[PDB]
Enzyme design. Structure first.
Site, mmCIF file in Angstrom:
data_model
loop_
_atom_site.group_PDB
_atom_site.id
_atom_site.type_symbol
_atom_site.label_atom_id
_atom_site.label_comp_id
_atom_site.label_asym_id
_atom_site.label_seq_id
_atom_site.Cartn_x
_atom_site.Cartn_y
_atom_site.Cartn_z
ATOM 1 N N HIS A 110 0.397 -1.718 0.370
ATOM 2 C CA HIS A 110 0.420 -0.581 0.201
ATOM 3 C C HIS A 110 1.109 1.753 0.065
ATOM 4 O O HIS A 110 -0.047 2.135 -0.066
ATOM 5 C CB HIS A 110 -0.337 0.202 1.344
ATOM 6 C CG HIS A 110 -2.267 -1.215 1.512
ATOM 7 N ND1 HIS A 110 -3.543 -1.017 0.189
ATOM 8 C CD2 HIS A 110 -2.049 -2.355 1.516
ATOM 9 C CE1 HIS A 110 -4.182 -1.810 0.832
ATOM 10 N NE2 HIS A 110 -3.135 -3.113 1.266
ATOM 11 N N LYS A 123 -8.890 15.036 3.872
ATOM 12 C CA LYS A 123 -7.935 12.828 3.736
ATOM 13 C C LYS A 123 -7.035 13.303 5.189
ATOM 14 O O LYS A 123 -7.206 14.486 5.624
ATOM 15 C CB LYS A 123 -6.725 12.965 2.821
ATOM 16 C CG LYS A 123 -6.632 14.213 2.295
ATOM 17 C CD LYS A 123 -6.093 14.593 0.796
ATOM 18 C CE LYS A 123 -6.909 14.450 0.016
ATOM 19 N NZ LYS A 123 -6.851 13.441 -1.238
ATOM 20 N N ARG A 124 -6.191 12.279 5.244
ATOM 21 C CA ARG A 124 -6.029 12.290 6.478
ATOM 22 C C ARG A 124 -4.595 13.777 6.339
ATOM 23 O O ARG A 124 -3.969 13.472 5.379
ATOM 24 C CB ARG A 124 -4.613 11.266 6.969
ATOM 25 C CG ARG A 124 -5.665 9.963 7.504
ATOM 26 C CD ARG A 124 -6.255 10.533 8.590
ATOM 27 N NE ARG A 124 -4.964 10.855 10.160
ATOM 28 C CZ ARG A 124 -4.735 9.267 10.814
ATOM 29 N NH1 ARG A 124 -5.397 8.431 10.678
ATOM 30 N NH2 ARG A 124 -3.527 10.125 11.601
ATOM 31 N N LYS A 158 0.480 14.817 1.076
ATOM 32 C CA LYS A 158 -1.235 14.880 0.821
ATOM 33 C C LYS A 158 -0.642 17.027 0.172
ATOM 34 O O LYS A 158 -2.178 17.003 -0.482
ATOM 35 C CB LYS A 158 -2.041 14.453 1.675
ATOM 36 C CG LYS A 158 -2.053 12.561 1.474
ATOM 37 C CD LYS A 158 -2.809 12.225 2.517
ATOM 38 C CE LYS A 158 -3.243 10.828 2.713
ATOM 39 N NZ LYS A 158 -3.967 10.179 1.544
ATOM 40 N N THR A 215 -8.464 6.793 -2.638
ATOM 41 C CA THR A 215 -10.213 6.353 -3.181
ATOM 42 C C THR A 215 -10.612 8.170 -2.909
ATOM 43 O O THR A 215 -12.181 7.553 -2.860
ATOM 44 C CB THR A 215 -10.546 4.896 -1.936
ATOM 45 O OG1 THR A 215 -9.839 5.394 -0.202
ATOM 46 C CG2 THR A 215 -9.092 4.186 -2.152
ATOM 47 N N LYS A 269 -14.278 8.251 -4.691
ATOM 48 C CA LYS A 269 -15.651 9.535 -4.140
ATOM 49 C C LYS A 269 -16.020 10.411 -4.916
ATOM 50 O O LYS A 269 -17.523 10.396 -5.446
ATOM 51 C CB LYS A 269 -15.211 8.718 -2.257
ATOM 52 C CG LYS A 269 -15.024 7.877 -2.222
ATOM 53 C CD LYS A 269 -14.601 8.329 -0.119
ATOM 54 C CE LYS A 269 -14.181 6.996 0.432
ATOM 55 N NZ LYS A 269 -13.332 7.012 1.786
HETATM 56 C C1 LIG Z 1 -11.868 7.360 1.940
HETATM 57 C C2 LIG Z 1 -11.299 8.013 2.992
HETATM 58 C C3 LIG Z 1 -10.600 7.988 3.024
HETATM 59 C C4 LIG Z 1 -8.955 8.094 2.156
HETATM 60 O O1 LIG Z 1 -9.188 9.943 1.425
HETATM 61 P P1 LIG Z 1 -8.084 9.854 0.542
HETATM 62 O O2 LIG Z 1 -8.505 11.649 0.160
HETATM 63 O O3 LIG Z 1 -7.860 8.248 -0.746
HETATM 64 O O4 LIG Z 1 -6.891 9.943 1.541
HETATM 65 C C5 LIG Z 1 -10.009 8.455 4.734
HETATM 66 N N1 LIG Z 1 -10.140 8.252 5.475
HETATM 67 C C6 LIG Z 1 -12.260 8.252 5.323
HETATM 68 C C7 LIG Z 1 -13.011 8.533 6.987
HETATM 69 C C8 LIG Z 1 -12.403 8.454 4.329
HETATM 70 O O5 LIG Z 1 -14.020 8.014 4.191
HETATM 71 C C1 LIG Z 2 0.564 2.574 3.505
HETATM 72 C C2 LIG Z 2 -1.312 3.162 3.007
HETATM 73 O O1 LIG Z 2 -1.801 3.480 4.190
HETATM 74 N N1 LIG Z 2 -0.902 3.237 2.311
HETATM 75 C C3 LIG Z 2 -2.176 4.190 2.189
HETATM 76 O O2 LIG Z 2 -3.246 3.356 1.114
HETATM 77 C C4 LIG Z 2 -4.228 2.836 -0.001
HETATM 78 C C5 LIG Z 2 -5.311 1.621 0.269
HETATM 79 O O3 LIG Z 2 -4.743 0.864 -0.936
HETATM 80 C C6 LIG Z 2 -4.456 3.908 -0.369
HETATM 81 O O4 LIG Z 2 -5.174 4.253 -1.711
HETATM 82 C C7 LIG Z 2 -3.780 4.928 -0.397
HETATM 83 O O5 LIG Z 2 -2.949 5.929 -1.790
HETATM 84 C C8 LIG Z 2 -1.840 4.741 0.705
HETATM 85 O O6 LIG Z 2 -1.540 6.296 0.909
#
Ligand SMILES: *Cc1c(COP(=O)(O)O)cnc(C)c1O
Ligand SMILES: CC(=O)N[C@@H]1O[C@H](CO)[C@@H](O)[C@H](O)[C@H]1O
Ligand SMILES: O=C(N[C@@H](Cc1ccccc1)C(=O)N1CC(C(=O)O)C1)c1cc2cc(Cl)ccc2[nH]1
Ligand SMILES: Cc1cc2nc3c(=O)[nH]c(=O)nc-3n(C[C@H](O)[C@H](O)[C@H](O)CO)c2cc1C
Ligand SMILES: Cc1cc2nc3c(=O)[nH]c(=O)nc-3n(C[C@H](O)[C@H](O)[C@H](O)CO)c2cc1C
Ligand SMILES: *Cc1c(COP(=O)(O)O)cnc(C)c1O
Ligand SMILES: CC(=O)N[C@@H]1O[C@H](CO)[C@@H](O)[C@H](O)[C@H]1O
Lengths: 790, 77, 790, 69
Positions: free
Chosen positions: A338, A529-530, A535, A637, A641
């Site tokens: 990942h 996102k986090r 990011k 992901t 969405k």
């Molecule tokens: C989908 C989701 C994530 C992953 O989002 P990215 O923009 O791909 O980092 C993280 N936190 C929550 C609560 C989510 O629904």
């Molecule tokens: C180590 C880890 O949390 N990796 C995370 O895994 C998700 C699920 O594959 C990816 O979408 C994302 O880009 C990545 O930052």
């Protein structure tokens, strides 16, 4: 299960289960009464589904993960079971508001982000596809912390999600198991014995996973730590064993080598494998056919210990010869990679492993010897190759490279997006892929259309179903039929109205939750996102300030209004992430309270970003920020969405972003900045942020304002740390993509002034989102890795 | 009438005889669940500990205390 | 001061002070005995507080106002001194009811409404904050008249509040002073002399102002007029001088240029300034530091004469040169503007001032010349600017614009609410604010949490203290802690029970006081404030009739029951206000005695609305009517009392209403109707009430019933005057907000059917009321205008 | 206390509505706690609070053995 019987069941539960009547019942009692009413509808099918797997014995899939970011369960269950409309009516007839009851439920936040949500999305797809699959994790007493903002800073509050009870989990006392720790290895003539160990019991809790409209109900099994069996102190000390499943480590893409974390990893692995072995031996199925009956997917390296644990069981317990056990092991396991970020890599010090898991350390060594022996035999002169391919790293202190253990113990290794899987295969693990080219694969991530369309955006799902039928729910590729309406103005305005209502609903949210007044017609610019330097919500913050100054410069200039939203949690120890949050709340405070900008630009730091809150903001979004440095986001992901829900994307050619452009046409996304190759070239050549600050007048101003206290008057040097990293330690090159970014952003607003063209592009995105369903992702995993069928 | 007490996670220890001697084993009576108790979340209360006494002009104040919540569980009699 | 000694003191006073025993004592004797018992507890601290100000000489604040709407003093004093519970017990042990004794006390009604109550609330806050502040007014022999309703009409009865004696006032004979009137100016070589004047003595009466739990006891000094030194007629004629402090002018927002009123204004100003000067010269402190030791706040323009009086003293008496005196004067005074309504504006005819205060007229002229000279120098070509900025108006008859005198003689001018201060600064006095932008400020009004929460609503204060501590009393911003209980059903039901008990207690009041039977579970809809066309209880009356017809239309329709209460006094000469009262009592008579409506709707005209009665009805209120036309209510304070006591507000975006929405979230108040801009647009475009009567069927019916005698059968055209004003002279646009109002009202009842949501909103109001404490208002006055500290 | 204040039965009749039996001295702290509430929170004068307290509580003695004290 019509309306009258549903109201009856609700009243029955309110009375017998919650011990209440309508005059003393609380909102929480009403929520629980409904939850129980809905839960009952799962029982028949759950017993029949698990009974079916026993009778027909299809090959089973076990998704072993330390995280399951499930969110709330009521709505999801009502939808997958086709009971939402009836329940909605029942609750309304009873004089209650189902939305209010739904808000009572706590998120099951047993994950940090994408990784744990992918697991959650996969369980939903595996059940909808009717596969004999199980999810195996840890039932954390506390999930990801609840985030609060105090004086502009993030504060962590314990997420005590079980306090009031979880009606969706079922204790399975008859399957409790003992897990072993410490002790010492004893090599005898009857085999090797792991003795004098301390034992911690593992009690599994089953949660049903309803497939979408198909009578299938699979299981998610989470383990909880329990102690076995001065007196008072001895009883209190029982807290020490139970601490193993006490709390989720709140770090995203970050390895924290704490002993407790190691215990969690072995804990879930040992309990899980024993449970799988036991189920295998009772199947009515000789471990010869074990891998023809069992497939275990390693979600990241977190459960890497599962490989030497299976071997330990096969050899030490089942008495199989090493060679045979090793073969079955590889045929059983598959590993998913990942991330390529260095700080996320698990490298456990052999010292720590020696004390906690002495027998597993011996097993890993043996695996490494057999491994290196093979390599020495084929590439004799190549000494450094052995150093690079070893499971052991002797850099300073000796430690285990968990990723290498996963590669040699698995028959398949996959990345989560084309660009990422390529890097994993040919760059990072070139030494391994060269030997076994067929081992490495790609399996682009996905999201479930149920929770992420049907549930979160009923308005959109209805509009789509009205035009192309409901078949798209189970086969999202069906969305391409939406193309026929590309020149349909009435449809485009209907599409724009759905998004408009999402925005209004969410605006109501933001105004009651936050001070600020929102321009419901402004463009909703969102980045949730986090918080991560990679990011780059920081780059986003640079742009907000840019837009700010511009308005202050020419007040009456024609400016498309925006409501900028940035939300996410920072890991507790991540100082820069925390500084960036403070920087963002500071900026917002200035922007939102400046009379010259007023309703032109509003900035919001959406606190406590989590699954249930993602379901609200995502459908209300116009512009989705996916701006990580090229090569950093393995997949993503959240990007998917937003695409499925009618938002246009501004981002780099990274992770799955690349495939989104492929599917929708690069022209229908706002791509910008450096690409994988461009970041490389810049690295070789050397990056000096100081030069862009020099060249870019808008940037220099932003930076001088930050560093001079314009956004922290009472603490003029508060953001000194942010300034230093950007100038002398920005591994993610914020200044380098700043110009291309702002230019890209300008074009977005230009297109926003043209409702017909904006919405035409959105349509091209939605109609092209079919590839990103987790149903398609799971289908590829099933036929190319697990070798299983519905 | 009402009975008011503490819901101990562990009651009086289970006694075992080892080599003729008593041995104590934890009495984890809630492990499998108690169907006879009913959590009453709406009546949770905060209990105070430590801190210091402050004598003011509005009355005496007990401040800087640490708080521990008390969640009551009702059992029918 | 425990229970045993308190009973002892009471018996002692009953005997020695009232000359009674338990068999002959009256209820009034018991009240007085208790009052004296409580009063004794103030002496030590009052002497020490005033002695402290002398020794440490902190800058003093003098609130000069022609009104102090104090209400009753017993309870307030018992509470601020922490003696209420002990006294309550002492009186109970003696076999008496403290509530009955408390009812014996007369209100000290030395005010008309908001303006005089603000002064009263400010004295309480200034003492609680420990500031060296004094209140200076007139000890009227008669306060605001007692109102009676005869044949549905208001009747005025003299408010002889001193008849039985005031134990809370202390004659200070040693500080009596002479005030001068008439006479003629004599310009000599030793200075200018004001000779041949008639003298009226001013005897000051001190009343203690106890701070809330802090040992501080400040002073409120009220002056009473006394004559100096055919025989019989000559002695009777002494009544003429004493008539100056005989009675309060009973007008709210209305300038009545009577010569006696002018005498009152100069009277209080002359006595006050002489007293302040004398105290300054004895301070052990050269008038160089006068303004560093003295701050005098002009409460509205009523004491405007204080500016040329101070100058008169500085120049004619103290011999200071004009320039120096003028500088000290401006540094001494600060002016507060309370209204933009035209009929409240003080414009005294130079003729009248010439005869009564010839020397002050010369001083005002001089000030005006120096003033205009400055303006002529900076804006030569602008002739009309001089006309607009002059203290003199030559429109018909020449008169003095008192507001302009206050602006030039003060260093700070403030409005009482954001929206009002903005209008004062940029619209009304644009010519002045442009020259001195830093002069104009805002100081949003406030109310004291003691009298308006702790005293009047013990039940609520206790509930709040039980949950968040008692710190909120001295820092009301603390109420935001109440947010944590937003989802707490038990707390919300506890909140609803307090309001329920207030309603029951007050219902007992309404049934013994009035015929009608009250539905204790009905929604208490209340509008209590002075009767004004601009405050619109008429619009309210239109709605009551609307609800009436609706019930008559569909009898069995599900209607949330209401007890509608409207109370307030009309100035004696205000014909329309008196007509509106009659209109309301007429409507009530029909509604309350109509068998088809019965317990569904009851209307009450709460007579003799006053401070002690506000303390009863306000805590019992569910819905607070704050419906003045946007731009008319400078601030309002009744709106705040209701918000702090658990009532939801239905009103316009006017006065402080706007800030209440800001603090609590507009969504948590029932805002409606035109806004400042909407009333403007309508004005330009022209308003024609006839059109709404045309369009609105419910309105047309209401109007036809009024104008046809449905509510005055024996006098079919009795309300003809009301009909004409509404159709051809409604400066406050009743018909224009009627539709939005009724629609808003419908939503209120809808929310009332949902106890959990109603109470949830109330909680959001109370938790957001902290800003409206007068402690916060006084803090801003202290640091931004008076430059003083505790 | 909360149940008392919601009874629709300000603490004059508290002991006519409440009886609290102290089972051995283990919950002895209940006496100064009730007083603390009456005085510090409810603002009742000491004398009155003390009286209500005594009318509320009753104590049961279960042993004369020295080590149990
Ligand atoms: C989908 C989701 C994530 C992953 O989002 P990215 O923009 O791909 O980092 C993280 N936190 C929550 C609560 C989510 O629904
Ligand atoms: C180590 C880890 O949390 N990796 C995370 O895994 C998700 C699920 O594959 C990816 O979408 C994302 O880009 C990545 O930052
Ligand atoms: O926990 C469930 N039932 C409860 C039933 C129960 C309740 C109270 C005492 C004993 C048993 C349960 O099995 N336990 C509560 C105990 C604990 O907390 O350890 C064990 C349950 C039923 C169910 C049905 C579906 Cl479809 C999904 C999840 C479910 N959980
Ligand atoms: C992708 C990424 C994730 C990180 N996660 C964390 C974390 O979870 N906790 C923490 O204390 N630091 C974290 N850091 C900060 C890291 O440990 C180190 O302090 C800095 O990168 C050095 O600048 C992270 C850094 C990166 C690049
Ligand atoms: C805000 C306001 C206050 C008024 N106060 C009085 C008053 O106190 N006495 C009186 O005789 N008329 C009063 N009036 C009536 C006024 O003098 C005049 O008669 C009418 O407005 C003309 O319609 C008031 C009018 C307004 C708008
Ligand atoms: C507070 C108060 C007022 C002012 O009320 P508004 O509704 O602001 O006009 C008037 N009269 C009395 C007796 C008051 O207590
Ligand atoms: C002249 C006058 O009495 N003005 C009144 O003053 C009070 C106190 O500021 C305001 O709350 C109110 O809206 C206003 O009508």
């Amino acid at each position: 299960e019509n309306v009258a019987e549903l109201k009856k069941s609700f009243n029955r539960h309110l009375h017998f289960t919650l011990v209440k009547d309508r005059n003393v019942a609380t909102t929480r009692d009403y929520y629980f009464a409904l939850a129980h009413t809905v839960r009952d509808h799962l029982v028949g099918r759950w017993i029949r589904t698990q009974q079916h797997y026993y009778d027909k014995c299809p090959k089973r899939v076990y998704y072993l993960s330390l995280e399951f970011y499930m969110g709330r369960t009521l709505q999801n269950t009502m939808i997958n079971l086709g009971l939402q409309n009836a329940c909605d009516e029942a609750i309304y007839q009873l004089g209650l508001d189902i939305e209010e009851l739904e808000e009572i439920e706590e998120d099951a936040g047993l994950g940090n982000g994408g990784l744990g949500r992918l697991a959650a999305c996969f369980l939903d797809s595996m059940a909808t596809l009717g596969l004999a699959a199980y999810g195996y994790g840890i039932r954390y007493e506390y999930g990801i912390f609840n985030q609060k903002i105090r004086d502009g800073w993030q504060v962590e509050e314990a997420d005590d999600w079980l306090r009031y009870g979880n009606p969706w989990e079922k204790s399975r006392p008859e399957f409790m198991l003992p897990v072993h720790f410490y002790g010492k290895v004893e090599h005898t003539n009857t085999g090797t014995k792991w003795i004098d160990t301390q034992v911690v019991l593992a009690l599994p809790y089953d949660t049903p996973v309803p497939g979408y409209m198909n009578n299938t109900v699979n299981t998610m099994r989470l383990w909880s730590a329990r102690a076995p069996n001065d007196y008072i102190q001895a009883v209190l000390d029982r807290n020490l064993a139970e601490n193993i499943s006490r709390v989720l480590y709140p770090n995203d893409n970050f390895f924290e080598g704490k002993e407790l974390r190691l215990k969690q990893e072995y804990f879930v692995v040992a309990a899980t494998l024993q449970d799988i072995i036991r189920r295998f031996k009772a199947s009515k199925f000789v471990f010869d056919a074990f891998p023809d009956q069992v497939a275990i997917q390693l979600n990241d390296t977190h459960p890497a210990l599962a490989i030497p644990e299976l071997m330990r069981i096969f050899v030490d317990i089942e008495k199989l010869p090493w060679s045979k056990a090793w073969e079955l092991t590889q045929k059983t396991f598959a590993y998913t990679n990942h991330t390529v970020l260095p700080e996320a890599l698990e490298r456990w010090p052999v010292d720590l492993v020696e004390k906690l898991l002495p027998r597993h350390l011996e097993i890993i060594y043996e695996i490494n010897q057999k491994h290196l022996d093979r390599i020495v035999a084929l590439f004799p002169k190549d000494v450094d190759r052995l150093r690079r391919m070893s499971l052991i790293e002797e850099e300073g202190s000796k430690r285990i490279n968990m990723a290498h253990l996963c590669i040699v113990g698995s028959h398949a290794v996959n990345g989560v997006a084309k660009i990422h899987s390529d890097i994993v295969k040919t760059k990072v693990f070139k030494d391994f892929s060269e030997l076994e080219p067929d081992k490495f694969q790609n399996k682009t991530n996905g999201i479930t259309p149920r929770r992420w369309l049907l549930l979160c955006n009923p308005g959109l799902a209805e509009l789509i179903a009205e035009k192309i039928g409901e078949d798209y729910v189970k086969d999202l590729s069906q969305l391409t039929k939406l193309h026929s309406f590309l020149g349909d103005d009435v449809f485009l305005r209907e599409l724009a109205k759905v998004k408009q209502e999402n925005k209004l609903k969410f605006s109501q949210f933001l105004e009651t939750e936050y001070k600020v007044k929102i321009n419901p017609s402004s463009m909703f610019d969102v980045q949730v996102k986090r918080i991560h330097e990679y990011k780059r919500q920081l780059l986003n913050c640079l742009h907000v300030i840019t837009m700010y100054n511009r308005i202050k410069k020419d007040p009456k200039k024609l400016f498309v209004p925006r409501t900028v939203i940035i939300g996410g949690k920072a890991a507790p120890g991540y100082h820069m992430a925390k500084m960036i949050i403070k920087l963002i709340t500071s900026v917002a405070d200035v922007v939102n309270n400046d009379p010259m900008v007023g309703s032109k630009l509003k900035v919001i730091f959406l606190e406590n970003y989590r699954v249930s809150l993602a379901e609200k903001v995502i459908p209300a979004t116009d512009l989705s920020e996916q701006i990580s440095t090229a090569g950093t986001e393995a997949s993503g992901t959240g990007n998917m969405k937003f695409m499925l829900n009618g938002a246009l994307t501004i981002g780099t050619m990274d992770g799955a972003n690349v495939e989104m452009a492929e599917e929708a046409g690069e022209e229908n996304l706002f791509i910008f900045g450096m690409r994988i190759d461009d970041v490389a070239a810049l690295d070789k050549k050397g990056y000096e942020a100081k030069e862009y600050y020099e060249a870019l007048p808008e940037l220099k101003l932003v930076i001088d304002q930050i560093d001079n206290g314009f956004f922290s008057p009472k603490q003029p040097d508060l953001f000194k740390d942010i300034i230093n990293m950007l100038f002398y330690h920005d591994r993610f090159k914020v200044f380098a993509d700043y110009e291309a970014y702002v230019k890209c952003q300008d074009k977005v607003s230009q297109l926003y002034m043209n409702p017909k063209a904006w919405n035409t592009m959105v349509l091209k995105n939605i109609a092209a989102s079919g590839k990103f369903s987790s149903d398609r992702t799971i289908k590829e995993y099933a036929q190319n890795i697990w070798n299983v069928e519905p």
